[PDB]
Amino acid sequence: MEKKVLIVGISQKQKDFDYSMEELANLAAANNMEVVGEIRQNIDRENRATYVGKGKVDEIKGLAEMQDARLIIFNDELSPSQIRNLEEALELDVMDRTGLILAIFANRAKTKEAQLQVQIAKLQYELPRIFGQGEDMDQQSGKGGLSNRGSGEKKIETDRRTIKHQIRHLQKELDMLVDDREVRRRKRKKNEIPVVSLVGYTNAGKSTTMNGLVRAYSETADKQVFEKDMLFATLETSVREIVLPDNKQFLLTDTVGFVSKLPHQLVKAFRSTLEEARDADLLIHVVDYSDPHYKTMMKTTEETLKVVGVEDVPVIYAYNKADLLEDEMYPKQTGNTIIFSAREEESLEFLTEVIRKELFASYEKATFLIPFEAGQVVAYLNEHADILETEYLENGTQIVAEVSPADLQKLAEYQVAE
Amino acid sequence: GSTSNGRDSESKRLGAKRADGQFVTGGSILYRQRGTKIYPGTNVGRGGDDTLFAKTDGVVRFERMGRDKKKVSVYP
Amino acid sequence: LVPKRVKYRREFRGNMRGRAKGGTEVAFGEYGLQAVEASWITNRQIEAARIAMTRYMKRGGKVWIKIFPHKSYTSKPIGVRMGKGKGAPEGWVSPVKRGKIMFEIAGVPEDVAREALRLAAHKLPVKTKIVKR
RNA sequence: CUGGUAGUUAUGGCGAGAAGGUCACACCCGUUCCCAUCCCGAACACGGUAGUUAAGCUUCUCUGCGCCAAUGGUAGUUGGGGGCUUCCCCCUGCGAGAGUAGGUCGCUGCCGGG
RNA sequence: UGGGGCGGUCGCCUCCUAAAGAGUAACGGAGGCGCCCAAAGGUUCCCUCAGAAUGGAUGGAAAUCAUUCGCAGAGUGUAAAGGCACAAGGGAGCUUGACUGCGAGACUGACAAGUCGAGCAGGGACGAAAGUCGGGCUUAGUGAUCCGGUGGUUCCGCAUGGAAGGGCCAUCGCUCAACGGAUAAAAGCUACCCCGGGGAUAACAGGCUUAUCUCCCCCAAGAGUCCACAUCGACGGGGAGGUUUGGCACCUCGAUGUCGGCUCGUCGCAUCCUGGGGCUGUAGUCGGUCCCAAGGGUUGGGCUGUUCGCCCAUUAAAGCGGCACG
RNA sequence: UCCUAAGGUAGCGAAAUUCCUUGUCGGGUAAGUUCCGACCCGCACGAAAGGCGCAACGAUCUGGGCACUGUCUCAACGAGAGACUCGGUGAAAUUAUAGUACCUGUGAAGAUGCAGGUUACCCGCGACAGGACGGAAAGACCCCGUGGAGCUUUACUGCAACC
RNA sequence: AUAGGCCCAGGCGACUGUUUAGCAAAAACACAGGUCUCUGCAAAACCGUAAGGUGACGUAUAGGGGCUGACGCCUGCCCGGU
RNA sequence: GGGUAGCGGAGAAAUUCCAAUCGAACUUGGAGAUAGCUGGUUCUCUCCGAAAUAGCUUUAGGGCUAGCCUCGAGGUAAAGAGUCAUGGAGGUAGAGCACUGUUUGGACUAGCGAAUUCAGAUAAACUCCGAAUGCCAUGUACUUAUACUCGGGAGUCAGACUGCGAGUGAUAAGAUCCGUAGUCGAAAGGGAAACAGCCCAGACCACCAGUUAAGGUCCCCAAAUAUAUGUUAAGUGGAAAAGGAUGUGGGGUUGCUUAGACAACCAGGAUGUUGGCUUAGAAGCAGCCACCAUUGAAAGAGUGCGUAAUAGCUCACUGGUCGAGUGACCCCGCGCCGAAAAUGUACCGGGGCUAAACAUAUUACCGAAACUGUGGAUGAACCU
Numbered sequence A: 001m002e003k004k005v006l007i008v009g010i011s012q013k014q015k016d017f018d019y020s021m022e023e024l025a026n027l028a029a030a031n032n033m034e035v036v037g038e039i040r041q042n043i044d045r046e047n048r049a050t051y052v053g054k055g056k057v058d059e060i061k062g063l064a065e066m067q068d069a070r071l072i073i074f075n076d077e078l079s080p081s082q083i084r085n086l087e088e089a090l091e092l093d094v095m096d097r098t099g100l101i102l103a104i105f106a107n108r109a110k111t112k113e114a115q116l117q118v119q120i121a122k123l124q125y126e127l128p129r130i131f132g133q134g135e136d137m138d139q140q141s142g143k144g145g146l147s148n149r150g151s152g153e154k155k156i157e158t159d160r161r162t163i164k165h166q167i168r169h170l171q172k173e174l175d176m177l178v179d180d181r182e183v184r185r186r187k188r189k190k191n192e193i194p195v196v197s198l199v200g201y202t203n204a205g206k207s208t209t210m211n212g213l214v215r216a217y218s219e220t221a222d223k224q225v226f227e228k229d230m231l232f233a234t235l236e237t238s239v240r241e242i243v244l245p246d247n248k249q250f251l252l253t254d255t256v257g258f259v260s261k262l263p264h265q266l267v268k269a270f271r272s273t274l275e276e277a278r279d280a281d282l283l284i285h286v287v288d289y290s291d292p293h294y295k296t297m298m299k300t301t302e303e304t305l306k307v308v309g310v311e312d313v314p315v316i317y318a319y320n321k322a323d324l325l326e327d328e329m330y331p332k333q334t335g336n337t338i339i340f341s342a343r344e345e346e347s348l349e350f351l352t353e354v355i356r357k358e359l360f361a362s363y364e365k366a367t368f369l370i371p372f373e374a375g376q377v378v379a380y381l382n383e384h385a386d387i388l389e390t391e392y393l394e395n396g397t398q399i400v401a402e403v404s405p406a407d408l409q410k411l412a413e414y415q416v417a418e
Numbered sequence B: 001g002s003t004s005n006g007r008d009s010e011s012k013r014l015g016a017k018r019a020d021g022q023f024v025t026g027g028s029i030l031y032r033q034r035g036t037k038i039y040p041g042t043n044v045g046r047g048g049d050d051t052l053f054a055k056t057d058g059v060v061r062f063e064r065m066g067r068d069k070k071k072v073s074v075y076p
Numbered sequence C: 001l002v003p004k005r006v007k008y009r010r011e012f013r014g015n016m017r018g019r020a021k022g023g024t025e026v027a028f029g030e031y032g033l034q035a036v037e038a039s040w041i042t043n044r045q046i047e048a049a050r051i052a053m054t055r056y057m058k059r060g061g062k063v064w065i066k067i068f069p070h071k072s073y074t075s076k077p078i079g080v081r082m083g084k085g086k087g088a089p090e091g092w093v094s095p096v097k098r099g100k101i102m103f104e105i106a107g108v109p110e111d112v113a114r115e116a117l118r119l120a121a122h123k124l125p126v127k128t129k130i131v132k133r
Numbered sequence D: 001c002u003g004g005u006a007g008u009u010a011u012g013g014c015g016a017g018a019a020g021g022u023c024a025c026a027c028c029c030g031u032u033c034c035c036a037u038c039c040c041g042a043a044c045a046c047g048g049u050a051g052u053u054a055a056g057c058u059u060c061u062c063u064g065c066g067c068c069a070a071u072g073g074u075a076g077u078u079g080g081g082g083g084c085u086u087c088c089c090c091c092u093g094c095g096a097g098a099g100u101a102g103g104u105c106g107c108u109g110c111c112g113g114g
Numbered sequence E: 001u002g003g004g005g006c007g008g009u010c011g012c013c014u015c016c017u018a019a020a021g022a023g024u025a026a027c028g029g030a031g032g033c034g035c036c037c038a039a040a041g042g043u044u045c046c047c048u049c050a051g052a053a054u055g056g057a058u059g060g061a062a063a064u065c066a067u068u069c070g071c072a073g074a075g076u077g078u079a080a081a082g083g084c085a086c087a088a089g090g091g092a093g094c095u096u097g098a099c100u101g102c103g104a105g106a107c108u109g110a111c112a113a114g115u116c117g118a119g120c121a122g123g124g125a126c127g128a129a130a131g132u133c134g135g136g137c138u139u140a141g142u143g144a145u146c147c148g149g150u151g152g153u154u155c156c157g158c159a160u161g162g163a164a165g166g167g168c169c170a171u172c173g174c175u176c177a178a179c180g181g182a183u184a185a186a187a188g189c190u191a192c193c194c195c196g197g198g199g200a201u202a203a204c205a206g207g208c209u210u211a212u213c214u215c216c217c218c219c220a221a222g223a224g225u226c227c228a229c230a231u232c233g234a235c236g237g238g239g240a241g242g243u244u245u246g247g248c249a250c251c252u253c254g255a256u257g258u259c260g261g262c263u264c265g266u267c268g269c270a271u272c273c274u275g276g277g278g279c280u281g282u283a284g285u286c287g288g289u290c291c292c293a294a295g296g297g298u299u300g301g302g303c304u305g306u307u308c309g310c311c312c313a314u315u316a317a318a319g320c321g322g323c324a325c326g
Numbered sequence F: 001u002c003c004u005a006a007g008g009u010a011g012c013g014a015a016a017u018u019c020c021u022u023g024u025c026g027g028g029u030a031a032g033u034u035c036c037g038a039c040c041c042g043c044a045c046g047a048a049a050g051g052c053g054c055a056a057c058g059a060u061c062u063g064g065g066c067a068c069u070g071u072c073u074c075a076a077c078g079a080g081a082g083a084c085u086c087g088g089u090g091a092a093a094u095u096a097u098a099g100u101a102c103c104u105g106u107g108a109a110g111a112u113g114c115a116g117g118u119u120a121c122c123c124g125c126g127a128c129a130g131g132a133c134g135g136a137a138a139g140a141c142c143c144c145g146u147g148g149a150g151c152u153u154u155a156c157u158g159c160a161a162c163c
Numbered sequence G: 001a002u003a004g005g006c007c008c009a010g011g012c013g014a015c016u017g018u019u020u021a022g023c024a025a026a027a028a029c030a031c032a033g034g035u036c037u038c039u040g041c042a043a044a045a046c047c048g049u050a051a052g053g054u055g056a057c058g059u060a061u062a063g064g065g066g067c068u069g070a071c072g073c074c075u076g077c078c079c080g081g082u
Numbered sequence H: 001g002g003g004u005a006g007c008g009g010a011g012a013a014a015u016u017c018c019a020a021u022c023g024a025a026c027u028u029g030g031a032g033a034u035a036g037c038u039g040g041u042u043c044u045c046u047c048c049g050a051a052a053u054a055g056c057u058u059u060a061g062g063g064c065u066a067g068c069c070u071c072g073a074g075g076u077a078a079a080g081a082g083u084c085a086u087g088g089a090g091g092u093a094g095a096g097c098a099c100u101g102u103u104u105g106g107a108c109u110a111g112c113g114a115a116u117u118c119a120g121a122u123a124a125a126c127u128c129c130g131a132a133u134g135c136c137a138u139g140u141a142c143u144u145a146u147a148c149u150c151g152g153g154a155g156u157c158a159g160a161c162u163g164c165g166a167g168u169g170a171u172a173a174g175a176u177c178c179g180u181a182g183u184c185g186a187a188a189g190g191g192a193a194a195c196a197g198c199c200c201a202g203a204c205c206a207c208c209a210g211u212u213a214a215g216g217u218c219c220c221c222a223a224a225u226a227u228a229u230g231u232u233a234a235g236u237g238g239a240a241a242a243g244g245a246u247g248u249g250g251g252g253u254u255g256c257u258u259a260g261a262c263a264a265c266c267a268g269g270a271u272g273u274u275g276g277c278u279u280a281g282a283a284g285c286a287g288c289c290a291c292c293a294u295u296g297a298a299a300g301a302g303u304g305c306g307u308a309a310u311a312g313c314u315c316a317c318u319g320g321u322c323g324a325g326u327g328a329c330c331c332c333g334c335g336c337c338g339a340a341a342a343u344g345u346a347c348c349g350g351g352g353c354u355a356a357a358c359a360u361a362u363u364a365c366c367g368a369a370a371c372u373g374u375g376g377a378u379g380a381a382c383c384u
């Protein structure tokens, strides 16, 4: 059924501390749990032993036993000794934000890449905590003496080695999977298709933008990407063709969303996943302009991109949800900023116009004379470049069109000087 | 780990103590029961804890009263 | 598929001798899967088979599931010895005897029905066959 | 023919449709008396018989429900013998439950009156 | 007591396991008891429940009233099971049999104990008789002996009469709950330890098992710039191995030396390099994946007792396992 | 403001004390789980069971240099004492009897001796240690015995001594 | 032939000394110094049933017991419980 | 040269030393301390022959009473065992939905949704039903040899595996704990290569006699290179699943065909027309909507390849040559792949086998300490 939980937080000199508890409640509501009470404390430093102090523990226990809760959720990462102390004091179950995010990710992992990533993150998180957890059985006080027969080791060494071993096996499987993944990018790298990637915060509107663009400018436009409010809807990346009316081709990629106060054991998984965004040719930053806190989001967004390791890539900041705001006109371009609504034909037209302006800038005018009997080149021009005017001459076809340097070099014999 | 179970009561040795067609002496116990699973018949008495016993000498007969019930009698 | 409540939390495992007592004929739809052997069938297996065979038909026609997981089973973790009472319940199971019809479908032609039942039968731990009313 | 009183696993019950009579039985009339109501002569008790078969009661007809119930087959199984042992197969004897053919609108005894 | 310790339990009652007589084990699955009632006991007479529909002021889905249907769908002091509507359920009148001496004969049972009982005598309660009554619908609600206290008694009473003191009958004093109760009276450390024993019983290695583990597969939704099967593959399903974490306690306690390294190797192939090949998202270069293949080869240091691991610098390459972790 | 007899002061701090932990940053090295210097979320420092410093001292413990070298790469040669052959003298631990192969299997589940195969003329001398679950010591670990002894205390019952 | 290798930095203990004859030489013990407490002389304390002794042929600047351990700077709050 | 002596002394303190001995010296005595523990316990033959369980226990590897063995003696309205006939008590297997829990799909619905109904499921602790077996009696039935009471002497209280019925465990274990039968224990002989517990079968002694059981009959190695009819090509037999597959044999249906089928060969395979739309195009063959008509034997508004569009190739379909079969599905038998481990072939005991394998039927022989033959020894009961 649904479990009853509590959420506990300290001010800790955070600048807001209120959106943090709001999003913690939202995350709990995304794990088939409901918040039946929150406790906050305005302490500028974190308690070393119980994270809240002596009196707050009793207050929390009283509220939990009055509201009939089954678990307590703490807004920040805990310590193994803190977990031991809180569990002993409360006589309940204790869980922290990192555990909550891992729980959210575990049951939404479909492809085994995500499943293995979450598995390794969970084992890495639980590895330091097993010390006092297993000492209760290990610290049996009475075990023996000198024996002249034995393992030549103490039990702590043995169980440390056992827990250390399996981590390497799981990481090895991860590495093999990523190496296999690099095989499927061979065709993209061998050719030189430009790539543009959508990034941003969660529920910003990336998937809707991608679906609109795909419906507008794709051959197999029936290939849509899932969209919803919920929570981390897309846990996988997608790549699609986009072909423009002026006969230009590029690839559009979609990736996952993130949230503030992100665990460090899972940022490695995100760094593995965002490897397509790392080698992108253009970045589109979707921002939910309607949300008042959106500004804060932008900062934390760059922070994530600073950690996975994507930099020096041109970025266009797109402000979604323009229709939800009153007394505003859209689409509009200001510097490297776009104001638009994803569910609009004209907004998508403006965004794709901006993309075409930014990426393709080395398509210059050129004139070619293709002889009639030696034809089969006008088709290449029309299906690989945008033409302006062609003429039916007695000696052949006189075409003028704007092309790329590769086309110029390939068609260097047909050029005519002026 | 603990069971929290493990108790039982001593068996009470219920059921028929004499056979149909057997000769029996006065005062002998014929049947032990909870409730009147079998009723007393002719020359048969019912004890304080529902025990059926013979009141005379004779031969034991297990018989069927109206459709759903049974009884036991002793005939000289 | 889990029962809402049970009278007891622990139960004997039972046996699977003999032919199925009832439910050996197609009674609602036109097509059915029949068990040829006996097996425990869990609710994960039922759910996987149902999703496969329903997705193939694109939510057309009707599907009837003729078995319910009434029984529960327990287990013990790694590292515990024998004794100290019975273990904790894990999942729910349906014991299926030979001859039992466990899935029925209607509302689709021969090809769609037979291919959906073939797709479903590969998710199950028992040896099956396809029968028509 | 009827009134009383017994026996018998509902084949005897429930339901429906009709005939009959103060000879018996009953409803019915009344509350002085014995007796009675957590109040009520409704019941119980007592004192009579104008009307009545309207009901109970008695007699006849219905399978609608209920109940009783074969034959064959099948499940299971004692003993003997085999497999490829979540279990299965063969020989011999025993043999259901469900379903059905069919049965049933009771049958016997004693006493007093017509 | 699936080593011992920690935890739990120890007496009695009811059900399942228990294989259609009785009995039947496990640190198997579920619950109760250490009382209550002066009527909730005895007897005589009388009668019948839960719920629903309908109709009606406060009144409402449900309070009291009226009709109909209604085999028990209620109740039975309390847990369960077996019983009970000729009540064992519910009312009213009178009462104390919730009596004294016993008891043919049976059930159960190692003993000690426990259970049922017609009938006889004394004196009664209720009924007009017949008759019923030695507690409660049945089955839990309990503790031996020794030693003391209280009441009774035509018993004894150390020369004799008494007395002191005993006996006999009735009754009282136990979380003696480790509940057949060692004493009226009792907790810990031993790495400073000792003796008698045991592979009846743990720690190393062997054996069995294979949940877990490592490897290999089946189906195919999906990913892969179109495109299930170049390369991957969710939800589910099937095996091989015997190197992991476990289970068991079969050899060894009148001794089977236990980690890492050094010296010396040898074997398997699920192949790290080198040799041959099919497919490719194989233009070339550089690669990916699978099939054949065990002939030979497969580095020196920093840190840590370390195995492992991280780092430095190389190499064609810096394989994974078995041999009592050789 | 609540509670307390009162709420850990100075100084020091990943420490002979820190589980997480190879904490984080810096130094030293090509590379430093050890070492040195800082930081302070001290699992579980702390003021005569003293806190923090400190010249001189140490067959103390720890980290780094110069010099030096068979410690090592990677071993070679030479001297003497045993070993070896000859003459003299001459024990011991141990031992059920033995004409005492190998592989795969079987079996109280690890066989010289059992099965099926494969090898193998009889007797010695100099060497090496894989096995004889090799020898030595009725396992010190572990459990058991209504075994023992030493020690403790607000276990029980006592005794000395003192008031 | 016989005849100191040296230097830099850290923990611990001030130092010379003592110790598990036969596995541990030390960071353990001692120590000079500090402090608390008891003791008026037939002293307290200790041996012994006692007599008799040590203390001491001493007399509070002396003698017994507890803890700390050169030296430098210091040694905070609590008398509810025992 | 002297002093301190074991309920003690000495200790710059380590349980350190007090004659190679110290968490309490050595010697003699109490003393043959006590030991529910381990070891040992000495001549022969004859008859019988267990237990490894219940209850209680400061009990758990000890004991006591009962159960099971042996020796002696008694009494009968013969009480013991098997089958047959007859009569009973009892709710398991199976089944069912009448109650109680769990549960699926409709109709209808108090208001997505409680009740009523229709159909369909499920149960160790559900039952309107209900066996086979087992149990208790009766009999005068038939057969057969114990049964009980009293007394003397015990040992046993660690059990193991195999089949069947359950729990626990993972529907693991040569695991653990009960019920039921067997064998071992305490049982040799024959067969499973070897191999307590599986299969056959119970050794009084002797024989250079016979017949059989399980298992076998090419050689090791005694006996069939047996008989008849089929199957298998893997060394399957002699190891392993989900899945995959024109292996092979036997059946049962169905389409076309000597007015010529299937396969190949020869010839044709056309016209409006490049159908319309879209596109720079789109000509059958990028894509969308249509799929008509004519000649004719038929010939698609096109089956695939090909161009950039064409062009070009090919198919569907028809006539011609030869003249016998050919193509779809269902059931059953035996085989195939999936199939990898460490000293040496090593998953038939070996050689070897194409039967010396498998299926059905048949008949001889071998084969034990079983049973029989001949000769000895010996116990009991009952007779003369």
Ligand SMILES: Nc1nc2c(ncn2[C@@H]2O[C@H](COP(=O)(O)OP(=O)(O)CP(=O)(O)O)[C@@H](O)[C@H]2O)c(=O)[nH]1
Pocket (backbone or CB within 6 Å): A201, A202, A203, A204, A205, A206, A207, A208, A209, A226, A227, A228, A229, A231, A232, A233, A234, A235, A255, A256, A257, A258, A320, A321, A322, A323, A324, A340, A341, A342, A343, A344
């Ligand atoms: N009014 C308005 N609503 C919009 C606009 N764009 C998107 N939305 C809403 O916001 C939601 C965006 O969801 P989605 O794009 O799936 O979020 P996401 O970025 O994929 C979250 P994740 O990172 O897990 O994939 C949509 O459900 C849509 O209804 C817009 O322009 N205007």
Ligand SMILES: [K+]
Pocket (backbone or CB within 6 Å): C121, C122, C123, C124, C125, C126, C127, C128
């Ligand atoms: K299947």
Ligand SMILES: [Mg+2]
Pocket (backbone or CB within 6 Å): A141, A142, A143, A144
């Ligand atoms: Mg220890």
Ligand SMILES: [Mg+2]
Pocket (backbone or CB within 6 Å): none
């Ligand atoms: Mg009563």
Ligand SMILES: [Mg+2]
Pocket (backbone or CB within 6 Å): E183
């Ligand atoms: Mg006592």
Ligand SMILES: [Mg+2]
Pocket (backbone or CB within 6 Å): E191
């Ligand atoms: Mg110690």
Ligand SMILES: [Mg+2]
Pocket (backbone or CB within 6 Å): none
């Ligand atoms: Mg081990």
Ligand SMILES: [Mg+2]
Pocket (backbone or CB within 6 Å): E206
């Ligand atoms: Mg092992």
Ligand SMILES: [Mg+2]
Pocket (backbone or CB within 6 Å): E254
């Ligand atoms: Mg021994």
Ligand SMILES: [Mg+2]
Pocket (backbone or CB within 6 Å): E302
């Ligand atoms: Mg090193």
Ligand SMILES: [Mg+2]
Pocket (backbone or CB within 6 Å): E315
């Ligand atoms: Mg190289």
Ligand SMILES: [Mg+2]
Pocket (backbone or CB within 6 Å): E322, E325
């Ligand atoms: Mg190894």
Ligand SMILES: [Mg+2]
Pocket (backbone or CB within 6 Å): none
């Ligand atoms: Mg560092």
Ligand SMILES: [Mg+2]
Pocket (backbone or CB within 6 Å): none
């Ligand atoms: Mg460094």
Ligand SMILES: [Mg+2]
Pocket (backbone or CB within 6 Å): none
């Ligand atoms: Mg430091």
Ligand SMILES: [Mg+2]
Pocket (backbone or CB within 6 Å): none
């Ligand atoms: Mg210091």
